[PDB]
Ligand binder design. Sequence first.
Ligand SMILES: Nc1ncnc2c1nc(NCc1ccccc1Cl)n2[C@@H]1O[C@H](CO)[C@@H](O)[C@H]1O
Ligand SMILES: [Mg+2]
Length: 382
Amino acid sequence: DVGTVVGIDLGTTYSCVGVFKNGRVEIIANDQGNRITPSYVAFTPEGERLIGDAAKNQLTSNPENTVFDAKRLIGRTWNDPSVQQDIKFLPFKVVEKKTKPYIQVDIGGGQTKTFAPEEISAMVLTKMKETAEAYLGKKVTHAVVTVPAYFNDAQRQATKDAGTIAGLNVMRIINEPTAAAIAYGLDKREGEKNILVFDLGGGTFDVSLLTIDNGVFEVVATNGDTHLGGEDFDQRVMEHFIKLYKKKTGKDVRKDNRAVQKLRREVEKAKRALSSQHQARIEIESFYEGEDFSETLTRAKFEELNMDLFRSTMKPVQKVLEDSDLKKSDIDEIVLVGGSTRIPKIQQLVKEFFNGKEPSRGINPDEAVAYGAAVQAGVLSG
Ligand SMILES: Nc1ncnc2c1nc(NCc1ccccc1Cl)n2[C@@H]1O[C@H](CO)[C@@H](O)[C@H]1O
Ligand SMILES: [Mg+2]
């Protein structure tokens, strides 16, 4: 009894779930009305577990018991140099247990608990499963889950294991760039094509070179930047206004965690607005020492603050082409994935790199990966 199989994009910062119903893909909104769910887990001092939006929106109220970025640790050993580097930037405790990086949190009443990365990802998957069950009005037991194309055996197995813990039979593990290509129907075409998938997420940047031959895919090469994403663009804008505030008032706003988070939230809203407007107002009531903040950010200033970061996305694209023994003219399809690809400067740089070639468009870049996973889930549902 596979019932309705769900397609899940289990992302580093955000996750997305789809189902194939009545001849089309349906991306499912969670209990907060959002078509994407933060891959966040929070342990409150009352012994309650919060997942997704509720966990992310409570992060500032004590940051050591809010867990995120588990995807950076999943299927990795504790002594992996990538884990040893990542834990330096993570606010919650990571300890060595059974050779792996276990996440250590306070669960209330002086109780400390330890969770494997796949246990944290299983909580995110349980939330995705509940979002789908609330929509379908039936139990969900099977899934197609996506992973980055660079994921090794242990990472793919720990992702399946996260599914098992969540009460999901992970029938297929599919590569994220392949799922995005499927969303665009590139698997349902006769002939041979070279696809460049440009995936700029919340915290990661992945570039993948795929070949498609009569519905058959091959990942030829992968590259990117494991620590480059939308969150880094927000940070550059934050640093800018923190320095401007210190110059205008003489006050260092970084002492107050609430002030910094208020700026962070408003900066992320202004950034998103700048993808369709040339100016956005950043307004914060009682920002610091009861004083209001009111500043404008132009798209031109947003672009210059992030110019090095945006242009740096070009280097991995040149690297994949070299590793694939291909030239720019050999690319038949350019697929943009990740919410950060909405940035006009990002779309402009990709277009300029490919000498005016327009990328594939029309599928929401935050949902493209879950969309493709849901197409495959539809074939498995019967
Ligand atoms: N229009 C956008 N311009 C620039 N960057 C964007 C945009 N949309 C998103 N995301 C999706 C989204 C849409 C509406 C409301 C909330 C959200 Cl999160 N991003 C960025 O994509 C990353 C992963 O969502 C984040 O860094 C996010 O800040
Ligand atoms: Mg993604």
